[PDB]
């Protein structure tokens, strides 16, 4: 829900090298009517954080709402999600008047890379940059989603300051941290344009050694009496500026392209390059995403390419270099079959991921077995992650049907000598055989086929034989599953390992309800 900011959140100008910072001081000293050759200016140096700017509003000391920047005048109320952020106060004593604290909600570099890595082997959408990741965490209807993402935030300015005794920006930061606000660890009280450029350089050589992406520094004029005088240009003020860090893009050569199979089945590619040093670490493997990403980038195997790290962490590629291409470099013939199991590998009409059929693929085996067992499937309490891993280390089960073919002595003759718990585990098996039919298709673990899609698939036919014996046209005509879900369903049943798993399942005695 939109809300109008009390004071408008203006943007900032950008300086990239030293000469542009000198023109910045020249513009500032001129806007105040001072001799151009002056270095008496006291500054304040924060960091430009790769996140989302957020504004707070405290009336009579008590918190009212938390909103995003939006367009600089009207933001979006994220009152509940910002309160999932830890050290966020809601009541300041001895304070009366409109308080407007400004800040920035960022996301940890490790929490950021672990998300895209989760999205890489799964096929679910991926985070572009730390700003979209912070916005993707804030803009969530359920605040528990934001709480489960470790959303961390920093506040580094104040606008409407009714009842704030701070008279300089350095005392603003002191007053913020004194009231219990989460402030920036690195913020220096600078004097002179030379000390500001030195500070910016020291943050450059500390860019990689942070827990959060900082894409530059922020230089503010110390005296508030001078801030409320220099004024604004049009979109940015004349008393504060952002000094961006230099770009970090290293040129290297692409060597080999490999493919890994995700636990779900995502056929995720991977690029291997000549090991080059970026900032500090030596990057040699780059994320390659999906097939259409390669085809759009025209990444013929053997090309020389540019590469960086997304937010300073995730190594993603940039583009190709046609001037340095070999004439014999052929376009990468994308694999049509699974590399680790051999079975066919086909993708849907619109889905960019490629996926893999059923369980013979060792990358899916463990995930398919434990998904077959959970509450969302066949309800087999007793069989846990520590037990399934042993059944694969010893090699007693192949797919989910191998569980029903086990004996009481095979499960009792294991670790800790559990006889009665093997009886409880066995009882859940035959009790699962007479469970409803919709719980079976979901337990197979096909792509896109969730708990809701498996129920609509069950209402489509009703009988198990009607699903195996049904043309692709009559199964694409089901309501709920168009031409992307139903197309992924047909590829599963057309696979022999799925037909073998289902046949062994009915051979053990599965007659759904
Ligand atoms: Mn950076
Ligand atoms: Mn960045
Ligand atoms: Zn320059
Ligand atoms: Zn975390
Ligand atoms: Zn096979
Ligand atoms: Zn496979």
Residue numbers in the entry: 81 to 593
Authors' account:
We determined the crystal structure of the non-adenylated apo-DrLigAΔBRCT to a resolution of 3.4 Å. MR search with fragments/ensembles from the predicted AlphaFold2 structure gave a clear and single solution. Due to poor electron density at the beginning of the N-terminus and end of C-terminus, the structural model only contains residues 81–593. Non-protein electron density was modeled as two Mn2+ in the catalytic pocket, one Zn2+ in the Zn-finger domain, and three extra Zn2+ cations at the protein surface. Because we purified DrLigA∆BRCT with subdomain 1a, but it was undetected, we infer that subdomain 1a was adopting different conformations in the crystal structure. Neither NAD+ nor AMP groups were found in the catalytic pocket bound to the conserved K128. Interestingly, we identified an unexpected two-metal center that stabilized the empty catalytic site. In our structure, the two putative Mn2+ cations placed in the catalytic site are predicted to interact with residues D293, D295, G391 and also residue D130 from the conserved motif KXDG. Considering different reaction stages and conformations of LigA, we could infer that our structure of DrLigA∆BRCT represents a pre-adenylation stage of the enzyme. Moreover, the ligase activity of DrLigAΔBRCT was preserved, but its affinity to dsDNA decreased in comparison to full-length DrLigA, and reinforce the assumption that the C-terminal BRCT domain 4 is involved in DNA binding.
